[PDB]
Write an enzyme that holds these catalytic residues in place. Structure first.
Site, PDB file in Angstrom:
ATOM      1  N   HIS A  41      44.104  50.368  29.529  1.00 47.42           N
ATOM      2  CA  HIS A  41      42.678  50.289  29.934  1.00 47.42           C
ATOM      3  C   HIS A  41      42.508  49.260  31.070  1.00 47.42           C
ATOM      4  O   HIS A  41      41.389  49.181  31.564  1.00 47.42           O
ATOM      5  CB  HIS A  41      41.745  50.121  28.738  1.00 47.42           C
ATOM      6  CG  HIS A  41      41.685  48.771  28.108  1.00 47.42           C
ATOM      7  ND1 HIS A  41      42.021  48.564  26.776  1.00 47.42           N
ATOM      8  CD2 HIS A  41      41.302  47.570  28.594  1.00 47.42           C
ATOM      9  CE1 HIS A  41      41.835  47.290  26.473  1.00 47.42           C
ATOM     10  NE2 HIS A  41      41.420  46.651  27.576  1.00 47.42           N
ATOM     11  N   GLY A 143      38.348  39.426  27.987  1.00 51.17           N
ATOM     12  CA  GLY A 143      39.535  39.033  28.781  1.00 51.17           C
ATOM     13  C   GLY A 143      40.792  38.807  27.943  1.00 51.17           C
ATOM     14  O   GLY A 143      41.878  38.628  28.551  1.00 51.17           O
ATOM     15  N   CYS A 145      42.323  40.953  25.981  1.00 47.16           N
ATOM     16  CA  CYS A 145      43.176  42.167  25.882  1.00 47.16           C
ATOM     17  C   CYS A 145      44.534  41.902  26.531  1.00 47.16           C
ATOM     18  O   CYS A 145      44.584  41.281  27.575  1.00 47.16           O
ATOM     19  CB  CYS A 145      42.505  43.370  26.504  1.00 47.16           C
ATOM     20  SG  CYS A 145      40.945  43.739  25.661  1.00 47.16           S
TER      21      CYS A 145
END
Lengths: 302, 302
Positions: A41, A143, A145
């Site tokens: 993603h 942030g 991830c």
């Protein structure tokens, strides 16, 4: 003595954390040898996340559309691949700080340390369990991830988790390092059901053994029970059923304490039926299930 | 979102941990520049610890009686000094992994990360508070002495604690990195009173703010209170008295939540007088006091 939720020392993993940018989007990658692993993603805008076609989005991306920074060290991307829900970016430079490592897919109820990162920089470390419903109760702001979960065994870092998403319920979902989600979750901003989260019975029992080793013995009662009688109580209280595999795993702690596993189950039963009457065990006012039998022996044998 | 007890990333401190042996005794040292810091009780036998004369014991020790190993790297000792309850061993080699660092003596109620070590090797990391009675509720087996507590601020490691002893009550006592004990404790195996351990009120309030930020709002009630009215309740429940300094420190969290500090105090009061009625706050069945206002803003601003 004493008993604390204890993370593995994070230095070996700190050396692997990089920042991955693709157009608008910045998150954390893991740099091992000449490959950087991050959530796919990274290629999405906030808008794309509603219903992404990852194959189509990725096709509009070349090697030079992926900026990888390891501190100020800019890495050069020479190849990219989608594997399930992770991107693999081939870089020109092997990470010199690459520890001995494996990728492992962990079982529900197993524990691991998370190194929470933002912009490729470590902020903190905590211990997590893979819940029976394949969620984790983490701590992740925007942030985070690409932050990873791991175990260490002497020299070897076993990576088991990459953080991908927060469910609208505020619990966390992610993948192994092959990019396969734990549980039924997808990398899409839709409504997602976790399902019933049950208590990890073998872990509660380990922690009761820990409590006994540390002098907290008040909950030890006069009764014993059977696996079938105890499981009738486990089901009533949304506890995972206890198996002879679980009893075998508790053997070393039974041996150390001279308390039979079914005697400990009978204590747990009275705790479940009677509650804690406003007392505490190892400083907790509820039954703790995020310590494995291995975790207890670690913190009771060093 | 989510809320976890979170340690600082331990890598910068892992690089500083060495093994110090003096005759029979092995514990952990901290190697910064060309100085190794360890507990002076490294020079004691189990017998000496009953009533040690450290000055007399140390006099029978030369530089070559101190073996310092940093992994397999044997360091050469060229000077030794006793400073309060720490030994300073001058070595021939500056630690190349020395981080930017300071020595700080922390105030009671402040938090820090412990890297628990055995034989100069890291085993785990956890978050600790300096209790108002200058003890910590740690997790330390035999050989953990010399393990250190620290905070990180961007690049700078502030060392604040060195582990020296376990009290017969199972709580932990140690020094700053100048070798001055926190509290009234001595490095001698005698009976030692910690004194009453009070709850860190400003920390409980910070954690209530954390809970509100995370959607756990059930305990918010219709009342407000005064500093004097609240402190009458604090004293009754062995809570530290709240001061206008504490109210000022909570300002940013008040501002974020739009909940006045005295409104939060009135909620805490009802919690203290009524208990939790068998509910939970951020997954705890008791009021948590080992998160500072800084800790809450860290984990709520990244």
């Amino acid at each position: 003595s004493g008993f604390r939720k204890m993370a593995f020392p994070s230095g070996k993993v700190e050396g692997c954390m990089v920042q991955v940018t693709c157009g608008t989007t910045t998150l954390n990658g893991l740099w091992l040898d000449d490959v950087v692993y991050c959530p796919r993603h990274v290629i999405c805008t906030s808008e794309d996340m509603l219903n992404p076609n990852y194959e189509d989005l990725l096709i509009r991306k070349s090697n030079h559309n992926f900026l990888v920074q390891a501190g100020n060290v800019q890495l050069r991307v020479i190849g990219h691949s989608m594997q399930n829900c992770v991107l693999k970016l081939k870089v020109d430079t092997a990470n010199p700080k690459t520890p001995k490592y494996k990728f492992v897919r962990i079982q529900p109820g197993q524990t691991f340390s998370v190194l929470a990162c933002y912009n490729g920089s470590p902020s903190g470390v905590y211990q997590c369990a893979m819940r029976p419903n394949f969620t984790i109760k983490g701590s992740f702001l925007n942030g985070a991830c690409g932050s990873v979960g791991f175990n260490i065994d002497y020299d070897c870092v076993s990576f088991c988790y990459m953080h991908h998403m927060e469910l609208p319920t505020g619990v966390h979902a992610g993948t192994d390092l092959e990019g396969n989600f734990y549980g039924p979750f997808v990398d899409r901003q839709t409504a997602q059901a976790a399902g019933t989260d049950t208590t990890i019975t073998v872990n509660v029992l380990a922690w009761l053994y820990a409590a006994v080793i540390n002098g907290d013995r008040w909950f030890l009662n006069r009764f014993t029970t059977t696996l079938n009688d105890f499981n009738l109580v486990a089901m009533k209280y949304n506890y995972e059923p206890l198996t002879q595999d679980h009893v075998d795993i508790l053997g070393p702690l039974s041996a150390q304490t001279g308390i039979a596993v079914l005697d400990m189950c009978a204590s747990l039963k009275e705790l479940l039926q009677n509650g804690m009457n406003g007392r505490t065990i190892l400083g907790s006012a509820l039954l703790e299930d995020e310590f494995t039998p291995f975790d207890v022996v670690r913190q009771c044998s060093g």
